């Protein structure tokens, strides 16, 4: 089912910590690299960070406002992601979305490979919130 | 006075030997005259399980089987992700989940094109590849290629005769009470064996030789648990098998002169294939088997016929070929009784597989194309294979159940009458001269 | 971090009109890294076009993009009621730095 | 009777069928192997009969005595009261020796002697 | 006083038999290395006054030859490339480069995407094909496919192997002999008054052809007409000439041959551009020789058919090209030539030349089966074929009124006839050295 | 003349060429199969001659007389007026009667008589 | 004297002859099941005073061994996985894992698109190849392919079948015998004064090598030099040592073997990770048993050539790696070792180890033919083999300056030499037992 | 001495071991071809001896005298000093004739004479 599981809800204080989590079957890690995006009400989308899948290594890149103490990790068992948040800031009053995409190939032959359909579908969660 | 060495040539003396035999049919043509030579007053000690004709038949049938599949279409191009749902044609309660209506993308004669093909498959030929239970594959695509073409080539058990090579002879035992429990007192010489129908089965012996005087039991070691017991009946049991579904056979090309056959829509309501064994006949048959078991096992006791214990379907249920399709029929109604020392049919439900693994090996696979219309089988149960339970409480109440699915045990029941001997015409003896 | 500034910000056209959208950045990244999304109010955004011209599945044929150095664009040849959404420009240059968002109104 | 018709009979009776088991002794790779094997078997025996001076003979009287070690003998016992299958089994162990000393007692002890008289 | 049965061993006695003959010779498809060189000495036993009966059409020696030639082809075609990857859409039109009027529509310039050594790369290949080898796809205007892609794969490149008809000798196994007929007028049936024997036959060139038999045994004296049933229509009339007719065939086009790889060591050869103007392939048959030769055939037909009968020769009936034209191999190339100018006359009771146009074909089935196909690789440069017409395969038109004016036309659709024509001289016989006769002793 | 040279000759003359015929009875898978069959046929005839007491010798004398039924002729003709091809074709319907008679009347009984001379 | 011809059967007389031999054994590539096991019953005649002349070079027993082993390789590798589906472009980078300078650039991590169990889906593996297995395209730094994908398809898997050079014995058919030389100084230059016979030869290990003959029969007494024509520099010189030299070879890298499935039951094995650091493969020849041992080769050269002559041992000439280096099979993996440290010194008439670097190829052309190729499978863990240097294959250079400075180099790409060096003791003869002689009778 | 042990021995002594050689002349695809060769070779020599009237003999006697053209040595030496390998080499040329004369004067001639005396 191309639908990520939503989690990471609940009430926290800035003087504390919050852990967000997400993801689902079908669009598994072996076929996908995943990222977090956030959006404050009245604002556009902001990238938080991205983590690569197991095979190619897994190095994670982050946006400046979330570097150092707001990290991203990959589970590798249940196909889930985590986003760690601490010492919440006023710019963190945003909806946090889980999102990634799978490039799917379907080859018509086991000989030449230029006779192939191709599909590129992105999946998004609905988004959780940070109670700064 | 004394005796002097005399050399005699043409002396009728036999030695145990292993050689190749000529395979003759209706291979080379069979000589119409068996040329049986006068039953003679000799005693010949020989047995089964230590014989070589069985092993040679096993190797010969494998080679012939493969030779008929080599010049046929590989289905490798069809090992693609399949998508499907249940078949919705007034499916009975006993057929729920047995059929799936699957689509796939087939290749064409031209590299550039595709066909959207729908076909029906039996459940046992399909594996869930997970990623949502709507993405399944054919069961043998992760092993060697599945082969199918040549629908024109039958699976019929055309009789094979084994003929001695020059310098050799085949001895034939005519003892009506013959068993492996000692020598045969009634031996004739033949040039060729009778024809043996190479019928494939893993449980019941169909269309074989019949015992003539009584039901008899043969085994390598009847007191062990590690050996199978071959029971030969003297009264064939009629069994009627059918698949009452008015099918469709369709054909597409998957490549340059490469045809593929598949099951199309089924006309009418979907019903389960089944076998019918006459109940009274089966009851009499078992009673006779029991009377014979009581001669080898403790007598004056109670014995049981139990369900098979489990394993791959090939050996847990009754596997056989008929029509040109394979059946895997449940025998629970045949082996569910105990025996005390003091129009009415048995219905056996069946499963069907289109993709077949062979004789206890996994280096190949084959797909049986479907037959157009309704198939019906009538056959003679001439024997039965039993396996003895590995011990019992208080060493009593012996229990037997089906087992012994290895192919060699089927030929042991046909080749038991024959031995191969080498002729050694040169002998020395003493005379005055 | 590529800095995007969507020039229209406030586009208003009747359904049936062409919503020409534009975004600009001073950093030079290959056109492969251009991406546009569509966000209906109250919903998570969805990807329309990635790789400047390559289209995502589930997207109408009226959607097409292009771009190179600083000037990147999205064309919606005819707006339908379902397309009145905020559009976003993304420059996936190792960081998906997005622009402010362009609203398409009636 | 036919091939091996007398196999179970008295040695002295079976001697009347020696041409019977001779006549049909000698009549895709697994078939070619049988054809070749039958020929080698046939020729190995003919080679040996050749060495012993039995080429073309059913019965040969040799020049070598019979050591009691091989049987307790009553001509009735050997020829009238036993079959060939039974005999061959009693004398099975010794055989090789008979064949061996026989070829040693012949040929080089016969034909050289013949040339000395030419 | 009476006679006794006595046995003679080494008796010169014959019985009819069928056995396996050895292939003997003096790489190729036919003249392979797995064939035994013959003894160079022509060890015939010469003629003796023996009058053996033997014939054609019931003779299994020819049938064995037929089977061996086909099996050898399969052995040579199998261990080579497959052209399945070329069953693609071909985009072509009748693009010309000074092509003459007679050749309009004979060549098409096809562009297609072949596979290559690596899976991820593609070729852009132009190949010039003969028209007979491609067909419209979906009956569109510019979409073609190779003619045999809807049957089994076309399998051939391997230009290194020769198809030259190097002669094969047939030798009997010990205990057998071959009886050779030296009767210069021998028919295909009845006794041969002059019989000599050999262990090995002369070499017979396995020339594959149709209606005109090329490069075979020439009659020693007279034109001989041999048939299983001369008065039937179901049998062919096989005519052996006593003079060769010289025929010169050519494809006067300086063709370039290019190659690409389809896959891992899988080479494909194709016709590239052609240097010079394009002209139609053709065969030149000397006119005077042909007219005298045919007249001899007519006089001989009148010895089996009736007197004062007009004999006329018509062209072939049509149907598959393979049974309508003169089909032969030359240098590995395959010609399908018309015979319309050879059989167009009526015969009365009482440096000129014939030019036969040809239509060259690259993909053939070769025999009488359509379960395979092969692509003949092109040959670089200009090809010139010189050969001897040795005989004809004729068929009679069935149906007549008042027994007048019988019509003949070329036949020869089957290949067996090509070898029946050269094995009429031989019979296989088993020798039975053991005999019995009465005597005194 | 050479092999089969005598085929057109009369039987009498042809009896002097018995060795040209004998010498020519003995010399991919077909090459091997054909070679093996030539050997098998040779051996079958040699065994039959051995059974009749004709091993080695080209010409035999036997103890079986000729039933008159098998012929409408006599030594005036069988030998000077006919060839072997003509001859064999007229008696092919007695071949297995004669061979059977020779097996029984030659070595099967002659060698019993030889043991009785001890 | 009226003497009479007679015939003796069983006369012990030989003729030179060429026949086929039986394979006698004592899965595996060489000692296949289609080889006859024999009893441990060697037999001889207790050498009598028989003088025979035979030689090497013209000994057809060598040719039979060469052709016969090719026929085993060509069948042993048929039922294996084709690697055609792996002829894809590769994206390769350097491996960066504690690599010594000598191995810098020697390994490449390549990332390729492999087919899988399903035909419509594909996967991306990450395997390590040796630089010698890969050829660049387009002068790129990131576009590579396997070395033999532009020639015959690479075929190889079957890791379960051993390449170990298990010995094979040769046996003659009845009617034939093999003569065996027992001279200690036997060469092909004339007769062997002391000979015996065997029915079966001793076992020969079909060891594959090109410069140093490994694991062979050692000379009994003295180093001996044999050649077809010592004067002709186009001929090879086979030098048999009378003392073995121990050589220790290794690939000191704890490689992990990974496996993916390419297709329908078609497995592929590929070096997938290297535990520990990266070091160069190498061979060790003790100086102590090499520097003096070589002097015995020199002592013999001084008898074939003039004495008081200066000679030099130079490294190999170059060209194909397979004929430049010491090629050999070690544990199933193919090594191509440099010999420069073994053949550098010069000689005049008046402990330490030698370490030589080795490179490894997985994709090789196993024989001199180029129509086949194989990818030797990877071996799990660290491989070590110890073998005996039995002899050298040397090439003398040509030219002449003041009749001195004869230079010798390791070399020769032909493997016939590897059997000539052991089959030199055997000749095949035919026995013709039928003899004719004068006598009185 | 074993098989071929007499190859270096004087013809006289070597002629006394004829059975050691005679004994050993009889026993993927190549091994079958090798067996067929051994058989055909054996049979060709046996056939020739049979034709000459030496079936079953290791040592022959003839009616064909020795013309001196074939050799120039004493009857004693061609037995006391020479070995068989070197003899055969002195008479190699001319061997394909002794066989011719030997065969013509033996069975096809002697057997005709024998019938004329029955
Ligand atoms: C072996 O197989 C693998 C696949 O398993 C294959 O890798 C693919 O190769 C093809 C061909 O080179 C690539 O296809 C081209 O990609 C162009 C750029 O696409 C960009 O966007 C991709 C997705 O990122 C988006 O989505 C995510 C999720 O929503 C989001 O987070 C991001 O922000 C962003 O929106 C991205 O994966 C891709 O990056 C890879 O590819 C580029 C180019 O090769 C490379 O430089 C990168 O290093 C990285 O590997 C890229 O950023 C795209 O413009 C181009 O479109 C043309 O072709 C299509 C048809 O194919 C036309 O429709 C279109 O009009 C254009 O003409 C094309 O789609 C594909 O992206 C690769 N996929 C992956 C995962 O790498 C290997 O090449 C194969 N062979 C080898 C040698 O191993
Ligand atoms: C053998 O014959 C003798 C004759 O004296 C007799 O005593 C002996 O018991 C017999 N033995 C047998 C039956 O072998
Ligand atoms: C002789 O021949 C006649 C007919 O062949 C037959 O009835 C009779 O039995 C024969 N007698 C002999 C001697 O076999
Ligand atoms: C042979 O017998 C026939 C009669 O049966 C007779 O006519 C003929 O002349 C005889 N031949 C001779 C001369 O013996
Ligand atoms: C001896 O035989 C030789 C064979 O070459 C022959 O030339 C020579 O004349 C012979 N002498 C006689 C008298 O036969």
Residue numbers in the entry:
A (entry chain H): 1 to 52, 52A, 52B, 52C, 53 to 82, 82A, 82B, 82C, ...
B (entry chain C): 32 to 57, 74 to 141, 150 to 309, 312 to 321, 321A, 322 to 398, 411 to 501
C (entry chain L): 1 to 27, 27A, 28 to 94, 96 to 106
D (entry chain D), F (entry chain B), H (entry chain F): 520 to 546, 572 to 662
E (entry chain A), G (entry chain E): 32 to 57, 66 to 141, 150 to 309, 312 to 321, 321A, 322 to 398, 411 to 501
Paper lines:
Broadly neutralizing antibodies (bnAbs) to the HIV envelope (Env) V2-apex region are important leads for HIV vaccine design. Most V2-apex bnAbs engage Env with an uncommonly long heavy-chain complementarity-determining region 3 (HCDR3), suggesting that the rarity of bnAb precursors poses a challenge for vaccine priming. We then engineered ApexGT Env trimers that bound inferred germlines for PCT64 and PG9 and had higher affinities for bnAbs, determined cryo-EM structures of ApexGT trimers complexed with inferred-germline and bnAb forms of PCT64 and PG9, and developed an mRNA-encoded cell-surface ApexGT trimer.
We determined the structure of PCT64 LMCA complexed with a version of ApexGT2 called ApexGT2.2MUT that had the Loop2b glycan at N187 knocked out (T189A) and an N195D mutation that modestly improved the affinity for PCT64 LMCA (KD of 78 nM compared to a KD of 167 nM for ApexGT2). The structures of ApexGT2.2MUT bound to PCT64 LMCA and ApexGT2 bound to PCT64 35S both showed the expected 1:1 stoichiometry and tilted angle of approach relative to the 3-fold axis as observed previously for autologous PCT64 complexes (Landais et al., 2017; Rantalainen et al., 2018), as well as the extended beta-hairpin conformation of the HCDR3 domain as it protrudes into the trimer. In our PCT64 LMCA complex structure, the HCDR3 adopted a beta-hairpin conformation resembling more mature PCT64 antibodies (e.g., PCT64 13C), which suggested that either the apo coil conformation was a crystallization artifact or that PCT64 LMCA binds via an induced-fit mechanism. Sulfated tyrosines, which play a critical role in PG9/PG16 (Pejchal et al., 2010), were resolved in the EM map density for both PCT64 LMCA (Y100e and Y100i) and 35S (Y100f) (Landais et al., 2016). R169 was found to engage the LMCA through hydrogen-bonding interactions on all three gp120 protomers, and N167 was found to engage two of the three protomers. R166, native to the BG505 isolate, was positioned in two of three protomers for potential cation-π interactions with the aromatic HCDR3 residues W100b and F100a. In addition to engaging gp120 through protein-protein interactions, both PCT64 LMCA and 35S engage apex-related glycans, in particular the N160gp120A glycan buried in the HC/LC interface. We found that three glycans, N156gp120A, N160gp120A, and N160gp120c, were displaced less by the 35S Fab than by the LMCA, which is indicative of better glycan accommodation by 35S. PCT64 LMCA and PG9 iGL show near-identical binding angles with their respective ApexGT trimers.
